[PDB]
Design an enzyme around this catalytic site. Structure first.
Site, short mmCIF file in Angstrom:
data_model
loop_
_atom_site.label_atom_id
_atom_site.label_comp_id
_atom_site.label_asym_id
_atom_site.label_seq_id
_atom_site.Cartn_x
_atom_site.Cartn_y
_atom_site.Cartn_z
N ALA A 12 50.44 61.81 27.14
CA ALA A 12 51.02 60.66 27.83
C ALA A 12 52.25 60.21 27.06
CB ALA A 12 50.04 59.52 27.96
N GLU A 71 48.15 69.86 20.59
CA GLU A 71 48.25 71.17 21.23
C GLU A 71 49.65 71.34 21.83
OE1 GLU A 71 47.87 70.09 25.63
OE2 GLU A 71 48.19 72.05 24.67
N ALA A 99 42.50 67.06 20.41
CA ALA A 99 41.46 66.16 19.92
C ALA A 99 40.30 66.03 20.89
CB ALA A 99 42.05 64.76 19.59
N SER A 140 48.83 57.13 24.81
CA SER A 140 47.76 56.61 25.63
C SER A 140 46.69 55.99 24.74
CB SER A 140 47.13 57.71 26.49
OG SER A 140 46.65 58.78 25.69
N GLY A 143 43.36 59.27 25.44
CA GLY A 143 43.29 60.59 24.85
C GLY A 143 42.88 60.58 23.38
N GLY A 146 46.32 60.52 21.44
CA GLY A 146 46.94 59.24 21.76
C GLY A 146 46.25 58.10 21.06
N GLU A 254 63.23 40.46 16.77
CA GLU A 254 63.44 39.39 17.74
C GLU A 254 62.39 39.46 18.84
OE1 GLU A 254 67.42 38.76 18.77
OE2 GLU A 254 66.95 37.32 20.37
N1 LIG Z 1 51.24 57.26 32.75
C1 LIG Z 1 50.83 58.41 32.24
N2 LIG Z 1 49.56 58.53 31.77
C2 LIG Z 1 49.16 59.72 31.26
C3 LIG Z 1 50.03 60.81 31.17
N3 LIG Z 1 49.34 61.82 30.60
C4 LIG Z 1 48.09 61.41 30.34
N4 LIG Z 1 47.97 60.11 30.76
C5 LIG Z 1 46.78 59.26 30.60
O1 LIG Z 1 46.40 59.35 29.22
C6 LIG Z 1 44.99 59.47 29.12
C7 LIG Z 1 44.60 60.82 28.50
O2 LIG Z 1 45.27 60.90 27.27
P1 LIG Z 1 46.30 62.08 26.89
O3 LIG Z 1 47.63 61.52 26.40
O4 LIG Z 1 46.48 63.05 28.01
O5 LIG Z 1 45.47 62.78 25.71
P2 LIG Z 1 46.13 63.26 24.33
O6 LIG Z 1 46.86 62.10 23.67
O7 LIG Z 1 47.06 64.40 24.54
O8 LIG Z 1 44.84 63.58 23.43
P3 LIG Z 1 43.95 64.92 23.49
O9 LIG Z 1 44.34 65.82 24.63
O10 LIG Z 1 42.49 64.50 23.61
O11 LIG Z 1 44.20 65.58 22.15
C8 LIG Z 1 44.43 59.29 30.52
O12 LIG Z 1 44.14 57.90 30.70
C9 LIG Z 1 45.58 59.77 31.39
O13 LIG Z 1 45.54 59.30 32.73
C10 LIG Z 1 51.35 60.68 31.63
O14 LIG Z 1 52.20 61.58 31.61
N5 LIG Z 1 51.71 59.47 32.15
MG LIG Z 2 46.40 66.40 24.88
#
Ligand SMILES: Nc1nc2c(ncn2[C@@H]2O[C@H](COP(=O)(O)OP(=O)(O)OP(=O)(O)O)[C@@H](O)[C@H]2O)c(=O)[nH]1
Ligand SMILES: [Mg+2]
Ligand SMILES: Nc1nc2c(ncn2[C@@H]2O[C@H](COP(=O)(O)OP(=O)(O)O)[C@@H](O)[C@H]2O)c(=O)[nH]1
Ligand SMILES: Nc1ncnc2c1ncn2[C@@H]1O[C@H](COP(=O)(O)OP(=O)(O)O)[C@@H](O)[C@H]1O
Ligand SMILES: [Ca+2]
Ligand SMILES: [Ca+2]
Ligand SMILES: [Ca+2]
Ligand SMILES: [Cl-]
Ligand SMILES: [Mg+2]
Ligand SMILES: [Mg+2]
Ligand SMILES: [Mg+2]
Lengths: 442, 422, 54, 344
Positions: A12, A71, A99, A140, A143, A146, A254
């Site tokens: 994300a 990844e 993760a 996010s 994830g 994230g 700010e």
């Molecule tokens: N708005 C938005 N949300 C996203 C996007 N990609 C994933 N999400 C949200 O992020 C969450 C999943 O986390 P990710 O960012 O895909 O997971 P990650 O950070 O790559 O972590 P791992 O794959 O477990 O290592 C879910 O709630 C998704 O709907 C994106 O491009 N845009």
């Molecule tokens: Mg991922």
């Protein structure tokens, strides 16, 4: 001029970052190859755009950005797509296995193995800064990377850049697009561990964005691409003051000063208008009064909640396009006689207003129509705590049964960390309640 | 998280395994000689999950074929896609296992297992980043069951941080080779409870009923049974095999599907059931129908802990989301309330061969206890008289090992019952 | 309703309008927490390999 | 099939509404903590409004308006009236009221108390909270001390005959998700069965008309009507027979005016029109009438009961207009729709 470094963590974070930098390039007239004609000072400078872009002697404008994912498939797309030329290889960091939607795996197991590398790559960016302000961190809640790797990064960033501000853009989990049952666990774990390290955090609930795309862009089933284009407009509205001449929110400090009087209560609500479909054949352009009024509709907020049943600590209005102060003040006067806008006793009821005359830029072929004027309101309202309540409830349902907990303990996280994090959230809900609230068959 | 190593053991394991490779090779455009001849890049994007690339743009299944007799693997090698497998990945003995778990696990299988592990190690060694293993086998015989679970133990010991996934065929008197199947299956289930992360429970009872009741097959053959199995196996691996967001690798699948480590036995389902136009509403209703389930358990007799749904073909995602919500909203009692949002849905544009669209169901339901109770009853009917035990004690096992396997499977049953009522 | 701190530039302007007045862990600690977790993974794994050796 | 949850087991009205929804065969009740509901019949206190309207695929409705407590709490109502321009301190249908903590309106209250005391004006007030009648301020203040409101006590009530007796009017009002205001056609008079005695506010059975109170302390309970409830047909006949007027003219016009004024005042604060979930609510408005046939608002109840003989009809009306409006099933409305658009 003082530099800002953007860090994009996990899928994300990376994909939102991609969308933002694309938009930034369009806004500043920087080409996919990094050249920027209108920039007459070849090879260096301390203009406002230089807060986000460095320059080579060849005249290439390079995002002050680091992308990190455990990844490679998402970042490989950054390396191979339109703006591949924009970024130096060292700015794009990938592991081999992710993760697995597990905060503990992102934070402890895999985090431990990649954090020194990530920090080295950030240090390299920092050494290019003559006056680093601090960090904008995109990720996010849901994830594993994230959530888990970000909290680890934020902890270490406070250690290595103790004086630097850290702002977050955080994606709050929504089942309509979410990919894991345990996202409430990850959200609460990462919020707990990150809270003391973040100065100001802009939460975006995917549910709100999703529905804005359906309702206002007539997109039947929004994709991350639809969602990220809209998020990037909002992020751009928020960061425009760091990247353009002006006198409001001109530095990261700010943001806290104007939006966060209480350190823990540092999650401002973003509301954005107007969002109009590019496919809409006939569109009547909205006035300053109309777009300002729209800032007080839940349907336009980045998190669905009801500010009427809360209190404000601060409110900023950020306009882009044909807007002059007189109409803003007329708009506000009128809105004040209709809307419920209650500030807390210890703050003045007022608005800080910024106006950038350049209308919003939209991505050629995107979903968003060009408009003559737009606004992003940032209000620090206690109503956003509705979203913590939602999350905490879900957390409680699963945790009472220890559902999925074995996955986190198996990564070497102690169970106690669940309840500590939850306790902190409870304390946080209580804080919003105190700030925001006063005190049978009949 | 990329490569999976596939292993197929014993007669059932190899026959269904071979069909799985035939089916997905077709889906990915790989012909029997390992040459690619598809018309879509979606076909090759994640092909490395299941195939190695050899010289000449040849694709070779990352697959190891195991048996304690040569017969079935002679047949595999003669089979249509038999030449695609790597010749050195055929590992077999001559002795057979005589439908005897003790022979597969402790004596005949013991003698062969090291050479299987040499091949597994050679496969893992060329993996850029091995995710883990999938094993195909039955639980009612000797090799797939006894040697297959021996293998799983040795593999765990050598790769303890990798995912172990099985497609495990459960025996039924309705489609039965010998009376000792309940013994071999109970012994195996204890192994699976401890040493796999995810097990697809494929019930020969369910397969037979579907063939008989639904597909109007008067006299179903193992071949007919395997049609359903290969269709299901393709469905449940779609997310591993093609670009996508949800359950795209084995660990994320486990994390989404397994709330408590022992309760990792999944009931798969498929629609439409096959031996000319289906609507999203119809797919959705049929995928959740007991009659489309491959484990002979009544899902209304328990609750769903978690569910994964996978839709294949060109169809309205809007409609898919609507129908999936409708199922949950109109039968909400059957989804445990203490795991919010416990149903996840994927959509893949490429449909399986011969269909415009299809749906695959993977349920973690507490009703799976019915399948273990059934095995447990059959086990006990015999074990109370120590009937047929000499076949096992002759290989050095004692009765206590039977008592223990039985107790642990009854514990498993009690554990499902616990969350059924929570 | 008073307007204040009006600033104008070529690119835009800003001001404030009032409608009414009022009425960390060290690097050391971080490393120890990560090593504690790693030791725990190691112990759980050793326990597993012991059980498999039996 | 529509779905709903029940979270206030002590509510007689919604127990009846629940009974009715089932009986249609097109509504199913879920366990109270199942999130996949169309309709929440919510708890009285700390209803989790923040958790509503976040269920993809479900239009959600709840039987309370978040924020309506402003109208339905003694202290809140007083504040709301004084501070809202549409109502104002100069509002004519609400008795002079002050909020007194044991900010506090003490010195302002006394000032008006003294003012009356010097002008010889009748000076009885009533203190109550979420009851003491007295003509001495010191007593009123001292009682509290031991949040309240002191309220000019209506010394000149309209008295029924025979009985020379006091009463209050309950009106039921249903506000739907579109903010239509529906006044149930049937109201009820809660009567005192004890003659009004203005030379003794010590004995309160003739001064406070609550059902519970007359049901104990009144030794003439049930004497004039069953139980201490006179309904509209009879009250109207009485007004015609005795005062040569109708219920509609002398009283109901003021009532409709008051109801609409209160609810239109708080509409911007509580409306769910553009909200991710929707609300309706049933209110119990309580009125007093003076001997000039002037109507005064006493209070608004947020979780009222209904008169026994009216549950059937009103409760059916609730699912008709509040629920089936949002979730339609596969007259002579019992309600009066309160609307009025004067041009100026
Ligand atoms: N708005 C938005 N949300 C996203 C996007 N990609 C994933 N999400 C949200 O992020 C969450 C999943 O986390 P990710 O960012 O895909 O997971 P990650 O950070 O790559 O972590 P791992 O794959 O477990 O290592 C879910 O709630 C998704 O709907 C994106 O491009 N845009
Ligand atoms: Mg991922
Ligand atoms: N579905 C299916 N079941 C099989 C097949 N072959 C054997 N079985 C079942 O597997 C069990 C016998 O085990 P089998 O695999 O033949 O013995 P092994 O070679 O020692 O592993 C019984 O439950 C049979 O019904 C097959 O091709 N398909
Ligand atoms: N200002 C007043 N003048 C005369 N009688 C009053 C006044 N306020 C209350 N009462 C009497 O006391 C009763 C109860 O007061 P009220 O606040 O309406 O209900 P409750 O105390 O049950 O919430 C009323 O029904 C009425 O008979
Ligand atoms: Ca320059
Ligand atoms: Ca800090
Ligand atoms: Ca031998
Ligand atoms: Cl610093
Ligand atoms: Mg056999
Ligand atoms: Mg009352
Ligand atoms: Mg009351």
């Amino acid at each position: 001029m003082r530099e800002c470094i953007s860090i994009h963590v996990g899928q994300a974070g990376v994909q939102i970052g991609n969308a933002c930098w694309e938009l930034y390039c369009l806004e500043h007239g920087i080409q996919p190859d990094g050249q920027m004609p209108s920039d007459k000072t070849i090879g260096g400078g301390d203009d406002s755009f230089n807060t986000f872009f460095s320059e080579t002697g060849a005249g290439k404008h390079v995002p002050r950005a680091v992308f990190v994912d455990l990844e490679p498939t998402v970042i490989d797309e950054v390396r191979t797509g339109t703006y591949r030329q924009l970024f130096h290889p060292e700015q794009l960091i990938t592991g081999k296995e992710d993760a697995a939607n597990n905060y503990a795996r992102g934070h402890y197991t895999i985090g431990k193995e990649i954090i020194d590398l990530v920090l080295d790559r950030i240090r390299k960016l920092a050494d290019q800064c003559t006056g680093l302000q601090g960090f904008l961190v995109f990720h996010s809640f849901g994830g594993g990377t994230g959530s888990g790797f970000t909290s680890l990064l934020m902890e270490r960033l406070s250690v290595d850049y103790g004086k630097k501000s850290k702002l977050e853009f955080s994606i709050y989990p929504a089942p309509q697009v979410s990919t894991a049952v345990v996202e409430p666990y990850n959200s609460i774990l990462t919020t707990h561990t990150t809270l003391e390290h973040s100065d100001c955090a802009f939460m975006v609930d995917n549910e709100a964005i999703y529905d804005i795309c359906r309702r206002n862009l007539d997109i039947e089933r929004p994709t991350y691409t639809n969602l990220n284009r809209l998020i990037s407009q909002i992020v751009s509205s928020i960061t425009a003051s760091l990247r353009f001449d002006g006198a409001l929110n001109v530095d990261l400090t700010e943001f806290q000063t104007n939006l966060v009087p209480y350190p823990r209560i540092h999650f401002p609500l973003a509301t954005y208008a107007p969002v109009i479909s590019a496919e809409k054949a006939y569109h009547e352009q909205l006035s300053v009064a109309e777009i300002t009024n729209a800032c007080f509709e839940p349907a336009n907020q980045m998190v669905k909640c009801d500010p009427r049943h809360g209190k404000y600590m601060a409110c900023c209005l950020l306009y882009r396009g044909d807007v002059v102060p007189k109409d803003v003040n007329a708009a506000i006067a009128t809105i004040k006689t209709k809307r419920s806008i209650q500030f807390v006793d210890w703050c003045p009821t007022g608005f800080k207003v910024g106006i950038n005359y350049q209308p919003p830029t939209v991505v050629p072929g995107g979903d968003l129509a060009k408009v003559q004027r737009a606004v992003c309101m940032l209000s620090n309202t206690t109503a956003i705590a509705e979203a913590w309540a939602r999350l905490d409830h879900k957390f409680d349902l699963m945790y009472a049964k220890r559902a999925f907990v074995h996955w986190y303990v198996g990564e070497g996280m102690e169970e106690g960390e669940f309840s500590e994090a939850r306790e902190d959230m409870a304390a946080l809900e209580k804080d919003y309640e105190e700030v925001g609230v006063d005190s049978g068959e009949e | 998280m990329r490569e999976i190593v596939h292993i197929q053991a014993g007669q059932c394991g190899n026959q269904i395994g071979a069909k799985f490779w035939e089916v997905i090779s077709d889906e990915h455009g790989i012909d029997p000689t390992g040459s690619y001849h598809g018309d879509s890049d979606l076909q090759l994007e994640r092909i490395n999950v299941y195939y190695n690339e050899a010289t000449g743009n040849k694709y070779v299944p990352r697959a190891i074929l195991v048996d304690l007799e040569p017969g079935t693997m002679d047949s595999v090698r003669s089979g249509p896609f038999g030449q695609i497998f790597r010749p050195d990945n055929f590992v077999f003995g001559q002795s057979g296992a005589g439908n005897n778990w003790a022979k597969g696990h402790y004596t005949e299988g013991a003698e062969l297992v090291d050479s299987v592990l040499d091949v597994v190690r050679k496969e893992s060694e060329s993996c850029d980043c091995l995710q883990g293993f999938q094993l195909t086998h039955s639980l009612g015989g000797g090799t797939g069951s006894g040697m297959g679970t021996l293998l799983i133990s040795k593999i765990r010991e050598e790769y303890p941080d990798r995912i172990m996934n099985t497609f495990s065929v459960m025996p039924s008197p309705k489609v039965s080779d010998t009376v000792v199947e309940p013994y071999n299956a109970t012994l195996s289930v204890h192994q699976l409870v401890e040493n796999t992360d995810e097990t697809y429970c494929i019930d020969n009872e369910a397969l037979y009923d579907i063939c008989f009741r639904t597909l109007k097959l008067t006299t179903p053959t193992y071949g007919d049974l395997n049609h359903l199995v290969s269709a299901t196996m393709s469905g449940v691996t779609t997310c591993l095999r093609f670009p996508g967001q949800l359950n795209a690798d084995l660990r994320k699948l486990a994390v989404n599907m397994v709330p408590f480590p022992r309760l990792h036995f999944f009931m798969p389902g498929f629609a439409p059931l096959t031996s000319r136009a289906l609507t999203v509403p119809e797919l959705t209703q049929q995928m959740f129908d007991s009659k489309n389930m491959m484990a002979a358990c009544d899902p209304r007799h328990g609750r769903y802990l978690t569910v994964a749904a996978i839709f294949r073909g060109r169809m309205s995602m809007k409609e898919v989301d609507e129908q999936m919500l409708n199922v949950q909203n109109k039968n909400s009692s059957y989804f445990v309330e203490w795991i919010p949002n416990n149903v996840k849905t994927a959509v893949c544009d490429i449909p399986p061969r011969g269909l415009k669209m299809s749906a695959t169901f993977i349920g973690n339901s507490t009703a799976i206890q019915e399948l273990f109770k059934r095995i447990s009853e059959q086990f006990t009917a015999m074990f109370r008289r120590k009937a047929f035990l000499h076949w096992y004690t002759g290989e050095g096992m004692d009765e206590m090992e039977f008592t223990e396997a039985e107790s642990n499977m009854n514990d498993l049953v009690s554990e499902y019952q616990q969350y059924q009522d929570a | 309703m008073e307007v204040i701190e009006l600033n104008k530039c070529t690119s835009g302007q800003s001001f404030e309008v009032i409608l009414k007045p009022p009425s960390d862990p060290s690097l050391e600690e971080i490393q120890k927490k990560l090593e504690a977790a790693e030791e725990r993974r190691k112990y759980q794994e050793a326990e597993l390999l012991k059980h498999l050796a039996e | 099939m529509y779905t709903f949850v029940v979270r206030d087991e002590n509510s007689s009205v919604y127990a009846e509404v629940s009974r009715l929804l089932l009986a249609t065969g097109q509504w199913k009740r879920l366990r109270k903590d199942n999130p996949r509901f169309n309709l929440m019949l919510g708890e009285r206190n700390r209803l989790p409004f923040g958790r509503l309207g976040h269920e993809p695929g479900l239009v959600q409705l709840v039987n309370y308006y978040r924020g309506a407590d402003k109208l339905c709490r003694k202290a809140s109502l007083v504040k709301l009236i004084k501070t809202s321009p549409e109502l104002s301190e100069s509002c004519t249908w609400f008795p002079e009221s002050y909020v007194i903590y044991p900010t506090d309106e003490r010195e302002v209250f006394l000032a008006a108390y003294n003012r009356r005391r010097e002008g010889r004006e009748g000076n009885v007030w009533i203190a109550k909270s979420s009851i003491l009648i007295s003509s001495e301020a010191s007593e009123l203040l001292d009682f509290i001390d031991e949040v309240h409101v002191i309220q000019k006590y209506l010394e000149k009530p309209l008295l029924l005959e025979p009985g020379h007796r006091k009463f209050d009017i309950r009106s039921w009002v249903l506000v739907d998700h579109l903010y239509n205001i529906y006044l149930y056609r049937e109201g009820v008079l809660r009567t005192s069965s004890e003659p009004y005695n203005s030379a003794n506010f010590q004995d309160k059975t003739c001064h406070l008309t609550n059902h519970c109170i007359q049901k104990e302390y009144s030794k003439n309970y049930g004497r004039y009507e069953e139980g201490n409830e006179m309904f509209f047909e009879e009250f109207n006949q009485y007004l015609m027979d005795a005062l040569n007027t109708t219920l509609e003219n002398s009283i109901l016009l003021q009532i409709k005016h008051i109801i609409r004024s209160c609810l239109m005042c708080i509409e911007p604060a509580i409306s769910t029109k553009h909200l991710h979930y929707q609300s309706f609510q049933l209110f119990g408005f309580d009125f007093m009438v003076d001997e000039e046939l002037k109507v005064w608002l006493i209070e608004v109840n947020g979780a009222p009961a209904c008169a026994q003989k009216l549950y059937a009809e009103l409760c059916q009306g609730i699912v008709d207009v509040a629920i089936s409006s949002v979730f339609p099933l596969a007259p002579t409305s019992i309600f009066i729709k309160l609307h009025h658009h004067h041009h100026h």
